[PDB]
Write an enzyme that holds these catalytic residues in place. Structure first.
Site, PDB file in Angstrom:
ATOM      1  N   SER A  22       0.748  -1.245   0.000  1.00  0.00           N
ATOM      2  CA  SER A  22       0.000   0.000   0.000  1.00  0.00           C
ATOM      3  C   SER A  22       0.779   1.296   0.000  1.00  0.00           C
ATOM      4  CB  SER A  22      -1.088  -0.010   1.062  1.00  0.00           C
ATOM      5  OG  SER A  22      -2.003  -1.036   0.704  1.00  0.00           O
ATOM      6  N   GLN A  44     -11.000  -4.900  -0.349  1.00  0.00           N
ATOM      7  CA  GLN A  44     -10.369  -5.638  -1.437  1.00  0.00           C
ATOM      8  C   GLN A  44     -11.257  -5.878  -2.619  1.00  0.00           C
ATOM      9  OE1 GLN A  44     -10.520  -7.703   1.829  1.00  0.00           O
ATOM     10  NE2 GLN A  44      -8.395  -8.416   2.068  1.00  0.00           N
ATOM     11  N   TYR A  72     -10.967   2.728   4.694  1.00  0.00           N
ATOM     12  CA  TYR A  72      -9.782   2.470   3.878  1.00  0.00           C
ATOM     13  C   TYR A  72     -10.088   1.327   2.903  1.00  0.00           C
ATOM     14  CZ  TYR A  72      -4.918   1.320   2.847  1.00  0.00           C
ATOM     15  OH  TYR A  72      -3.704   1.050   2.269  1.00  0.00           O
ATOM     16  N   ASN A 118      -8.785  -0.655  -1.071  1.00  0.00           N
ATOM     17  CA  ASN A 118      -8.055  -0.759  -2.335  1.00  0.00           C
ATOM     18  C   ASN A 118      -8.984  -0.450  -3.508  1.00  0.00           C
ATOM     19  OD1 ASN A 118      -5.738  -1.730  -1.137  1.00  0.00           O
ATOM     20  ND2 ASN A 118      -6.129  -3.863  -1.696  1.00  0.00           N
ATOM     21  N   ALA A 173       1.687  -3.231   2.964  1.00  0.00           N
ATOM     22  CA  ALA A 173       1.967  -4.642   3.098  1.00  0.00           C
ATOM     23  C   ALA A 173       1.490  -5.440   1.899  1.00  0.00           C
ATOM     24  CB  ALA A 173       1.286  -5.194   4.342  1.00  0.00           C
ATOM     25  N   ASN A 202       5.685  -9.327   6.556  1.00  0.00           N
ATOM     26  CA  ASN A 202       4.595  -8.411   6.911  1.00  0.00           C
ATOM     27  C   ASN A 202       4.330  -8.448   8.426  1.00  0.00           C
ATOM     28  OD1 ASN A 202       2.244  -6.898   7.184  1.00  0.00           O
ATOM     29  ND2 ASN A 202       0.937  -8.444   6.243  1.00  0.00           N
TER      30      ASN A 202
HETATM   31  B1  LIG Z   1      -2.221  -2.044   1.775  1.00  0.00           B
HETATM   32  O1  LIG Z   1      -2.955  -1.419   2.896  1.00  0.00           O
HETATM   33  O2  LIG Z   1      -0.919  -2.523   2.251  1.00  0.00           O
HETATM   34  C1  LIG Z   1      -3.082  -3.282   1.170  1.00  0.00           C
HETATM   35  N1  LIG Z   1      -2.218  -4.272   0.509  1.00  0.00           N
HETATM   36  C2  LIG Z   1      -2.665  -5.226  -0.379  1.00  0.00           C
HETATM   37  O3  LIG Z   1      -3.859  -5.326  -0.709  1.00  0.00           O
HETATM   38  C3  LIG Z   1      -1.618  -6.202  -0.934  1.00  0.00           C
HETATM   39  C4  LIG Z   1      -1.790  -7.558  -0.232  1.00  0.00           C
HETATM   40  C5  LIG Z   1      -1.956  -8.793  -0.804  1.00  0.00           C
HETATM   41  C6  LIG Z   1      -2.077  -9.816   0.174  1.00  0.00           C
HETATM   42  C7  LIG Z   1      -2.003  -9.360   1.437  1.00  0.00           C
HETATM   43  S1  LIG Z   1      -1.786  -7.670   1.481  1.00  0.00           S
HETATM   44  C8  LIG Z   1      -3.916  -4.024   2.221  1.00  0.00           C
HETATM   45  C9  LIG Z   1      -3.343  -4.997   3.114  1.00  0.00           C
HETATM   46  C10 LIG Z   1      -4.167  -5.781   3.959  1.00  0.00           C
HETATM   47  C11 LIG Z   1      -3.542  -6.810   4.869  1.00  0.00           C
HETATM   48  O4  LIG Z   1      -3.562  -6.612   6.103  1.00  0.00           O
HETATM   49  O5  LIG Z   1      -3.026  -7.828   4.357  1.00  0.00           O
HETATM   50  C12 LIG Z   1      -5.565  -5.585   3.934  1.00  0.00           C
HETATM   51  C13 LIG Z   1      -6.128  -4.612   3.081  1.00  0.00           C
HETATM   52  C14 LIG Z   1      -5.318  -3.823   2.231  1.00  0.00           C
END
Ligand SMILES: *[B]([O])([O])[C]([N]C(=O)[C]C1=[C][C]=[C]S1)C1=[C]C(C([O])=O)=[C][C]=[C]1
Ligand SMILES: [K+]
Length: 358
Positions: A61, A117, A147, A149, A315, A340
């Site tokens: 992110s 997501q 928050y 994506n 992450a 992570n």
């Molecule tokens: B961001 O907030 O880091 C975002 N990242 C992603 O969607 C990339 C990922 C793929 C698998 C796990 S993270 C994000 C991270 C998470 C989390 O806690 O894993 C949740 C929602 C958004």
């Protein structure tokens, strides 16, 4: 490097790596406009490859800060307006819940509860349209922040439409190239694989998997050197020669909404400085809980405030990143790890380091 920086970084990070069992880590501290680098451990445990200043880490992110600045650059170019309805770019979004949702709402997670997501089953352009058409908001736009994506991801995709370029081409030509981020990638080229660290989840080596709106929401990979240059660029936008990019960086750090002690920019999130770690954790997405928070509009947005703690956590399944900087102190930090680990631990370490050097 100055001993004070050497000491606070090693005394803070060594214990962090041990406590969190992080395989490899790179850290950059920007002090008075100069970067200082530190690395530990392994980019690839099995092949015994060490983390170096050229190692690529998945930013997760933190990629949203690049998306926010690219959107700001498009605003500066006169290509889009944040007040524009989403339907101006995507006329096909005919479902009535979209009336009243603007690019500002998408960029700032205030559209009314777009999901965290994009589902794995959503891949194609038609799948994406169907997903957004079927989404039912929980709240009216501009009332609560959640928050997501799927929110800033859609903003990035729509923001580059007038340019006539793919999102990746727009990012490369308008942000990476001008700032000399020459080892920053949305797709890692085969020639660069030798420097691409593996992420580690439950002890298994992993890389992020393709997904809809991945480039826009969490798909940038970069080195500690390029990330230090990204922080430098965001600390001192007036040094940037490309006018629209300078303006875009300033727009991404403007304060659009407030919830508690936190202010939402485009990608970046900000708190007034000084502030303690507990308040940063509770006033950010660095908290363990997924939170719906009512927001107050800042009408009109406040231009980038110098005395701010500006930051973003990121992450992927196998990586954990963090960036924070304080413009008025010309101070910043980037922490990239191939595990992570808990966000609060990232904030605690970053604050310990920057507070010691301020
Ligand atoms: B961001 O907030 O880091 C975002 N990242 C992603 O969607 C990339 C990922 C793929 C698998 C796990 S993270 C994000 C991270 C998470 C989390 O806690 O894993 C949740 C929602 C958004
Ligand atoms: K994609």
């Amino acid at each position: 490097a100055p001993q004070q920086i050497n000491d606070i970084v090693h005394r803070t990070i060594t214990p962090l790596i041990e406590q969190q069992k992080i395989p490899g880590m790179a850290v950059a501290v920007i002090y008075q406009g100069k970067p200082y680098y530190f690395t530990w451990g392994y980019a690839d445990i099995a092949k015994k490859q060490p983390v170096t200043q050229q190692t690529l880490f998945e930013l997760g992110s933190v990629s949203k800060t690049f998306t926010g600045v690219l959107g700001g650059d498009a605003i500066a170019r006169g290509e889009i307006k944040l007040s524009d309805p989403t339907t101006k770019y995507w006329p096909e979004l005919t479902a009535k819940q979209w009336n009243g949702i603007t690019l500002l709402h998408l960029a700032t997670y205030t559209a009314g509860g777009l999901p965290l997501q994009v589902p794995d089953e959503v891949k194609s352009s038609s799948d994406l349209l169907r997903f957004y058409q079927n989404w039912q908001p929980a709240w009216a736009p501009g009332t609560q922040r959640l928050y997501a994506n799927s929110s800033i991801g859609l903003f990035g995709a729509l923001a580059v439409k007038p340019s006539g370029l793919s999102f990746e081409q727009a990012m490369q030509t308008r942000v990476f190239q001008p700032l000399k981020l020459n080892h920053t990638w949305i797709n890692v080229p085969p020639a660069e694989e030798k420097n691409y660290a593996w992420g580690y989840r439950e002890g298994k080596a992993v890389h992020v998997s393709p997904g809809a709106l991945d480039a826009e929401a969490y798909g940038v990979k970069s080195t500690i050197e390029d990330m230090a240059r990204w922080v430098q660029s965001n600390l001192k936008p007036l040094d940037i020669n490309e006018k629209t990019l300078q303006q875009g960086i300033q727009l991404a750090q403007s304060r659009y909404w407030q919830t508690g002690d936190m202010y939402q920019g485009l990608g970046w999130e900000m708190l007034d400085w000084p502030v303690n770690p507990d308040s940063i954790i509770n006033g950010s997405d660095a908290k363990i809980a997924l939170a719906a928070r009512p927001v107050k509009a800042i009408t009109p947005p406040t231009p980038a405030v110098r005395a701010s703690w500006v930051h973003k956590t990121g992450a992927t399944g196998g990586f954990g990143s963090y960036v924070a900087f304080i413009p008025e102190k010309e101070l910043g930090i980037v922490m990239l790890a191939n595990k992570n680990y808990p966000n609060p631990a990232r904030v605690d370490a970053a604050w310990q380091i920057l507070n010691a050097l301020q």
